[PDB]
Structure 1
Amino acid sequence: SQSLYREIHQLISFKDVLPDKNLLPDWSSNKNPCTFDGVTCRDDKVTSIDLSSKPLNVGFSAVSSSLLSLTGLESLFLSNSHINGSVSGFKCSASLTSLDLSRNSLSGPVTTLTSLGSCSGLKFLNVSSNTLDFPGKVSGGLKLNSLEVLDLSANSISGANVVGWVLSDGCGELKHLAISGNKISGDVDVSRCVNLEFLDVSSNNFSTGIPFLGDCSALQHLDISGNKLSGDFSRAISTCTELKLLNISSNQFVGPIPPLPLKSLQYLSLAENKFTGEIPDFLSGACDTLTGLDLSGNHFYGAVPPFFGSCSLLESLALSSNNFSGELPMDTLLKMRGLKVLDLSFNEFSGELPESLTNLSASLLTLDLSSNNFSGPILPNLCQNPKNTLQELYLQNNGFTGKIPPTLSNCSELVSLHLSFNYLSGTIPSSLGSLSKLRDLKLWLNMLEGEIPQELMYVKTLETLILDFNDLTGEIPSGLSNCTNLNWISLSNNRLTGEIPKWIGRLENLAILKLSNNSFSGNIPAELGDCRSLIWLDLNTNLFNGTIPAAMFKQSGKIAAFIAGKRYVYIKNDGMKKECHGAGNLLEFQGIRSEQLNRLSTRNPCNSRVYGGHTSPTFDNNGSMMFLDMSYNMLSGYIPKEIGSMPYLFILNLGHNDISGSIPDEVGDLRGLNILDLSSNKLDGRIPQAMSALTMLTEIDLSNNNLSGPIPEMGQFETFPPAKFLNNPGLCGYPLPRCD
């Protein structure tokens, strides 16, 4: 036939316009397209093409001209295919049923989509994750009332009543409308869309009316989350008898939980609003079907009602960041046969942990009790129940006393263990070495004693070891060398001894090493220079000595930084108190209230400058050290000129050592430098004029040295007070007295 002749010539013309033709190596002239990778055939005819996640790097016009006009083509999948340009008029086969152009670079007004009316059989359209917008006046209509499924999410569509524009020429056929992640506002009226099953208008700019749903006869999924809505959503959905998922989270709803349609409800989220009061008894009506409940981040209080025992299907219950109280309602929890995630964090539950909690160890995946006022010991009998499934145990920021139950080694599925901010005494059980899947061990701010267990070597998966603020002793166990995936080691504020092992150069995943305020000693191992992920090195307040090895900077410019997305807290030191040392403590802060930072004050001579966030380096490839504090040690000799080879270095603290020689002119290359402390050393010579080039300095200290001659007049030096240059006899020039 001709369509066969035409099919093959159309496919190859397309292949030929690709900048990297090597992309479709088995597509070739004089070969049957039904044997081509990417192609689906039925009865020797092409029915589908899927070139998704291939970087075609071509424009839509190539697509519409070569592919969309193919006789008999039923679907075209081109997600994440580096297609750019915009849609416009073309000839389109009548059999084309589905078009997926998601995750591309289509641009232009969303009205360009109207030209897909050419495709008279088009029922499913995905253009999510592009840059389609809506310039100015919202008039006319999209004119694609034949669609069953339309996804316009994650575009650049900003405007009022864009939804009216989509539905203007009818929506009797529409089953699924998604338009989340834009900047759309105004009215949402889908009452004429009597077949609509799925509506997602989340993460937009709605702040007026609640969506009008009319009879709401087929609606199963309603997501209006991530807006600024308030008002009577209860009345709006009261007719929705088929509703399975209702997500109204992250809005501005206030008041108690109002009536809800419960007979079909599987997932409910009211999280991150301003709801008040107690959980009402009438919610028992969903217990036949409810699968997920989320009430987090409101102002709820009281206790978890008894009726929840009948919710035998409830898999996850999240109630964090409210004000629930009383004891852990074990009587109710134990009936929840299907429960898998339990999150009561950031409330005021109190009392000791009930013995019966040991049964849940066999059903739960996540147990999060962090940031409550629990007291007593961690259940020793925990994970007795053979076939322990528990993966995540979060008990941080409570009032637990006693030992860390070695028993915890029986929860053999554990990937994450956070017992920080408690009053735990005793040792770190050697048996934790058994947790062969453990990635995160966080035990900081307790009273743990004894040595860091050698047996940790048995945990190949270990990524974070956070042991700060305890009473630990002994040396860094050689065993940790086997833990090659470690990316965050924090041992500060203990009483550890010995040297930094040279095997540390072996850990090529290690981004953060914090060992401040201990009694570590000897030389800084040149081997640190071998760590290719290292961006945060804190050794302040120890007994280190020898000279700073030039080699430790060999990675500069070669660093790519698995460390991001972890909640941290950075407590900046004010030079006000002399007992307070270092630039500042970077600390892990998952599941802990900042209000409880005051717990540190019995363990920390530091008075109040707090920087929150989630870890997030600034480069992605070819960066360098970002933080280097080696202050308050006994380092000597001169500063290597390779010190200047770190353009991402925000902070440099070498204060309070015995460093001598002159300041290398290469310090002037540290263009990202915010802080520079070299105070209380034996540095001499001149401040290099090269340092006039730095533009990001917020703090400098060069006081208590033997520096001499004039302070550089250009750059930022005139900006700092005399105090920063005191006790340098040969030193003159503003902010000091003019030079003789």
Structure 2
Amino acid sequence: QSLYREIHQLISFKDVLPDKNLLPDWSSNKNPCTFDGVTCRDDKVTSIDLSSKPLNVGFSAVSSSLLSLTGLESLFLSNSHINGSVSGFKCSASLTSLDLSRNSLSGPVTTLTSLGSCSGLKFLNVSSNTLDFPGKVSGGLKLNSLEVLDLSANSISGANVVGWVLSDGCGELKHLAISGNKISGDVDVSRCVNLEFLDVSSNNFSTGIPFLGDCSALQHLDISGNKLSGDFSRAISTCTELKLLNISSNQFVGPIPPLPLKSLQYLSLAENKFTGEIPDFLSGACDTLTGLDLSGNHFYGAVPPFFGSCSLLESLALSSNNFSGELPMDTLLKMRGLKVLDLSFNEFSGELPESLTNLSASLLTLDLSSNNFSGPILPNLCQNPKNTLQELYLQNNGFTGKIPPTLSNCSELVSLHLSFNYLSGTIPSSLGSLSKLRDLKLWLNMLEGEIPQELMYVKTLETLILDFNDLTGEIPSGLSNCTNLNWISLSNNRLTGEIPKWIGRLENLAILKLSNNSFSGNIPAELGDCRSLIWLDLNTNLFNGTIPAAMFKQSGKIAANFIAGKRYVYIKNDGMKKECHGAGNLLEFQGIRSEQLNRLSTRNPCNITSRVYGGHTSPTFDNNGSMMFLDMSYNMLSGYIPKEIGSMPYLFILNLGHNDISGSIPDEVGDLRGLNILDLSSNKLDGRIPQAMSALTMLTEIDLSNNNLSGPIPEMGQFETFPPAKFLNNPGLCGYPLPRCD
């Protein structure tokens, strides 16, 4: 046996794969110690790693072939497209680690009890599978030799499952993760005297806090992501060695209870309902504290002063509370090690004390957004050379004055967010010297001047958001270089010129919003060479010419992906203030408060109060793909609607109102089976509403008023839902909701 067995066992596995090419250098009459994925010691196989290879075989193929291999010590099959479920099998006494994570194992978690045939198994990872819990609890896992067990991200829903895992003993257990399930009930790890790591986060625990007993070895405790309301302080009081405590995203209330700080490195109480003010007793942790997160509560007060002793604190998150007072920098500068600072969403007032520039060479993220500050953006900022700052967020404050050009000295800057302020002046050209910047956001300020040509010197830029400023001039040609741009927005400015034809060279452009400006010219067919475009808002401009049929070629071959994951707001235009134009205004909204959109009142006649949608971007498709949004109302368009208009299936919205468009509504509009909004009012359209539109099943708003249209209204579909107003000022038109055809 020995070799003969080793090779015949491995090739038998290979020979059951559906794609034997996945193990190309495995072969007969050749030593396995030369195989990719194999590890050998002294010419004997000791480990097999076939992770991230789509083997597409059942576990039964693994147990008989690989797990029975004599002398095998570890098997790694993570993300290897193994399905089926565990059953009994001869398991060599040498196997100590099995990793079956990110696979499709199924069935009750009681299947795992048969892994007890591996007398030496100490590390089991079956996370990110689909194991469920038998409706009823019974027996135990009965793998009481394990030191490490990860059951996370399965489909386990039940009560006292934790009790089940540990029923028959846990003396040896050192690491237990069960996050990402729907487990509820009680957690009693008091008999697991060696437990050092407990992750019961993102579960369905809503009763009591886990019982930890002596807690004489616990170093990592993560109970975040539940609905826990209780007295965790009592439960963790005896925990002498705790290094990390994450209780975020729960239902905890009240002031900060006492804690064991003698070894605490990370502490998060975020996303609860704690009240009060940072107690002084927390100073005892500054000897060891590396990360603090108090964000998302109801705390108040000012950054207490003892934080100077927190020399080790690498990150301070205090956002979304009721903190106040000038920047307590008298303390911050003592934080030699601080690298992330986040005071956003408080009421820290006053100006920026000039001594900030020192901390700009140790920090990597500075977030003062959505506060009450006022005063100039310190020009001397980033004077201390070797400025490592990567992100600057000062939006939604009371900051006034010119945009400092010194900001070009933060050579490592990747995101600059100064929106929602009262910043006057021009946009510094030195920002072009920010060779790594990806996000420039300065909308709703008082920024005069033209858009710097020097932005061509930024080969990384991705987003350029400058709405609601006093910008003037034309679109700088230099942006043809920013190949990676995916989100340009210049609305509510006084820009002029024409949409440059080189707009098509940006194969990453997903969003282009240019409303309430003084642009002009025929719309460019080149926009049809934008393979990422899903959002094109051109309303309230002076464009003219007819509509290029060629701007709809990419429909069907779009893949929107670069765009997903950014906080936004969509403001639906109410059909009330005729002074307000467009379907709606989509706007980036990272770090700004929804409660400050009223600042637009003096800049926009739209009654925003009614409609404000938001969230984080989540494109609907991935391949396939087509434009989702398309607004061009309140321009000087004319000619006939190209029948290519109806080639965008994922299209939600379509506004072509208040123009000079004629011809007959193409019968392709009925093909837009995702259409929720359709505006074509105030035009010169003739013909009949194509009965093909009766196939539109998702129309929530339609408007065809003020045209030369004639004939019947489709009695099928949704046209009977809509009111006469949406069909008025069309003499020939008849049919309910209009009068019957005489």
- Give yes or no for TM over 0.5: yes
Q: Aligned equivalents of 1:225 and 1:614: distance in 2? A: 22
**Structural mapping, 1:550-565, within 5 Å:** 550-561=549-560, 562-565=562-565
Render the CA deviation track for 1:129-181: whole Å, top value 9, x for unaligned: 00000021011100000000000000000000000000000000000000000
Render the CA deviation track for 1:268-309: whole Å, top value 9, x for unaligned: 000011111110111000000000000000111111111100
Render the CA deviation track for 1:227-279: whole Å, top value 9, x for unaligned: 01111100100000000000000111111101100010000000011111110
Q: Aligned equivalents of 1:253 and 1:737: distance in 2? A: 61
Residue 477 of structure 2 corresponds to residue 475 of structure 1: no
Q: Aligned equivalents of 1:306 and 1:361: distance in 2? A: 20
* 3-state SS, counterpart of residue 513 of structure 1: strand
Render the CA deviation track for 1:474-506: whole Å, top value 9, x for unaligned: 000000000000000000000000000010100
Q: Aligned equivalents of 2:685 and 2:702: distance in 1? A: 15
* 3-state SS, counterpart of residue 31 of structure 1: coil
Q: Aligned equivalents of 1:306 and 1:709: distance in 2? A: 77
**Structural mapping, 1:388-399, within 5 Å:** 388-399=387-398
* 3-state SS, counterpart of residue 659 of structure 1: strand
Report the counterpart of residue 733 of structure 1 in structure 2: 735
Q: Aligned equivalents of 1:273 and 1:556: distance in 2? A: 45
Report the counterpart of residue 665 of structure 2 in structure 1: 663
Q: Aligned equivalents of 2:231 and 2:694: distance in 1? A: 62
Q: Aligned equivalents of 2:64 and 2:645: distance in 1? A: 58
Residue 82 of structure 2 corresponds to residue 86 of structure 1: no
Q: Aligned equivalents of 1:256 and 1:691: distance in 2? A: 60
Q: Aligned equivalents of 2:741 and 2:567: distance in 1? A: 50
* 3-state SS, counterpart of residue 191 of structure 1: coil
Which consecutive unaligned segments of at least 5 residues does structure 1 have? none
- Alpha-carbon distance, 1:6 to partner: 0.8
Q: Aligned equivalents of 1:19 and 1:476: distance in 2? A: 56
Q: Aligned equivalents of 1:689 and 1:251: distance in 2? A: 54
Render the CA deviation track for 1:13-52: whole Å, top value 9, x for unaligned: 1111111111011000001000000000000110000000
* 3-state SS, counterpart of residue 358 of structure 2: helix
Q: Aligned equivalents of 2:508 and 2:62: distance in 1? A: 43
Render the CA deviation track for 1:571-605: whole Å, top value 9, x for unaligned: 00111111100100000111001000000000001
Q: Aligned equivalents of 2:415 and 2:721: distance in 1? A: 47
* 3-state SS, counterpart of residue 660 of structure 2: coil
- Alpha-carbon distance, 1:469 to partner: 0.5
* 3-state SS, counterpart of residue 63 of structure 2: helix
Report the counterpart of residue 681 of structure 1 in structure 2: 683
Q: Aligned equivalents of 1:84 and 1:580: distance in 2? A: 57
Q: Aligned equivalents of 1:14 and 1:688: distance in 2? A: 61
Q: Aligned equivalents of 2:290 and 2:365: distance in 1? A: 16
**Structural mapping, 1:200-599, within 5 Å:** 200-561=199-560, 562-599=562-599
State percent identity of aligned pairs. Answer: 100
Render the CA deviation track for 1:638-658: whole Å, top value 9, x for unaligned: 000110100000000000100
Runs of 4+ aligned structure 1 residues displaced above 4 Å come to none
Report the counterpart of residue 69 of structure 1 in structure 2: 68
Q: Aligned equivalents of 2:546 and 2:87: distance in 1? A: 68
Q: Aligned equivalents of 2:311 and 2:360: distance in 1? A: 17
Render the CA deviation track for 1:631-676: whole Å, top value 9, x for unaligned: 1000010000110100000000000100000000000000000000
Q: Aligned equivalents of 1:231 and 1:734: distance in 2? A: 61
Q: Aligned equivalents of 1:266 and 1:300: distance in 2? A: 22
* 3-state SS, counterpart of residue 76 of structure 1: strand
Render the CA deviation track for 1:393-433: whole Å, top value 9, x for unaligned: 00000010000000000000000000000000000000000
- Alpha-carbon distance, 1:616 to partner: 1.0
Q: Aligned equivalents of 1:21 and 1:543: distance in 2? A: 63
* 3-state SS, counterpart of residue 301 of structure 1: strand
Render the CA deviation track for 1:594-633: whole Å, top value 9, x for unaligned: 0000000000010121111111110000110000001100
* 3-state SS, counterpart of residue 107 of structure 1: strand
Render the CA deviation track for 1:178-198: whole Å, top value 9, x for unaligned: 000000010100000000000
Q: Aligned equivalents of 1:629 and 1:183: distance in 2? A: 44
Q: Aligned equivalents of 2:452 and 2:210: distance in 1? A: 58
Q: Aligned equivalents of 1:250 and 1:622: distance in 2? A: 37
Which consecutive unaligned segments of at least 5 residues does structure 2 have? none
Residue 42 of structure 2 corresponds to residue 46 of structure 1: no
Q: Aligned equivalents of 1:313 and 1:613: distance in 2? A: 35
Q: Aligned equivalents of 2:296 and 2:716: distance in 1? A: 51
Render the CA deviation track for 1:673-694: whole Å, top value 9, x for unaligned: 0000000000001111111111
* 3-state SS, counterpart of residue 171 of structure 1: coil
- Alpha-carbon distance, 1:453 to partner: 0.2
Q: Aligned equivalents of 2:613 and 2:383: distance in 1? A: 41
Render the CA deviation track for 1:44-103: whole Å, top value 9, x for unaligned: 110000000000011101011110000100000000000001011111010000000000
Taking structure 2 as the reference length, what is the TM-score of the superposition? 0.99
Q: Aligned equivalents of 2:417 and 2:33: distance in 1? A: 55
Q: Aligned equivalents of 2:357 and 2:247: distance in 1? A: 35
Render the CA deviation track for 1:346-375: whole Å, top value 9, x for unaligned: 000000000001111111000000000000
* 3-state SS, counterpart of residue 412 of structure 1: coil
Q: Aligned equivalents of 2:137 and 2:506: distance in 1? A: 57
Q: Aligned equivalents of 1:539 and 1:368: distance in 2? A: 33
- Alpha-carbon distance, 1:733 to partner: 1.0
Q: Aligned equivalents of 1:132 and 1:252: distance in 2? A: 28
- Alpha-carbon distance, 1:714 to partner: 0.6
Report the counterpart of residue 59 of structure 2 in structure 1: 60
- Alpha-carbon distance, 1:123 to partner: 0.2
Q: Aligned equivalents of 2:541 and 2:405: distance in 1? A: 31
Q: Aligned equivalents of 1:422 and 1:490: distance in 2? A: 17
Q: Aligned equivalents of 1:82 and 1:729: distance in 2? A: 64
Q: Aligned equivalents of 1:44 and 1:135: distance in 2? A: 44
Q: Aligned equivalents of 1:60 and 1:735: distance in 2? A: 63
* 3-state SS, counterpart of residue 613 of structure 2: strand
- Alpha-carbon distance, 1:3 to partner: 1.7
* 3-state SS, counterpart of residue 717 of structure 1: coil
* 3-state SS, counterpart of residue 521 of structure 2: strand
Q: Aligned equivalents of 2:666 and 2:95: distance in 1? A: 69
Taking structure 1 as the reference length, what is the TM-score of the superposition? 1.00
Q: Aligned equivalents of 2:412 and 2:492: distance in 1? A: 30
- Alpha-carbon distance, 1:209 to partner: 1.0
* 3-state SS, counterpart of residue 49 of structure 1: strand
* 3-state SS, counterpart of residue 526 of structure 2: helix
- Alpha-carbon distance, 1:313 to partner: 0.4
* 3-state SS, counterpart of residue 386 of structure 1: coil
Q: Aligned equivalents of 2:596 and 2:439: distance in 1? A: 22
Render the CA deviation track for 1:311-334: whole Å, top value 9, x for unaligned: 100000000000111010111000
Q: Aligned equivalents of 1:200 and 1:266: distance in 2? A: 17
Aligned length: 739
Q: Aligned equivalents of 1:361 and 1:188: distance in 2? A: 45
* 3-state SS, counterpart of residue 70 of structure 1: coil
Render the CA deviation track for 1:112-138: whole Å, top value 9, x for unaligned: 000000100000000000000002101
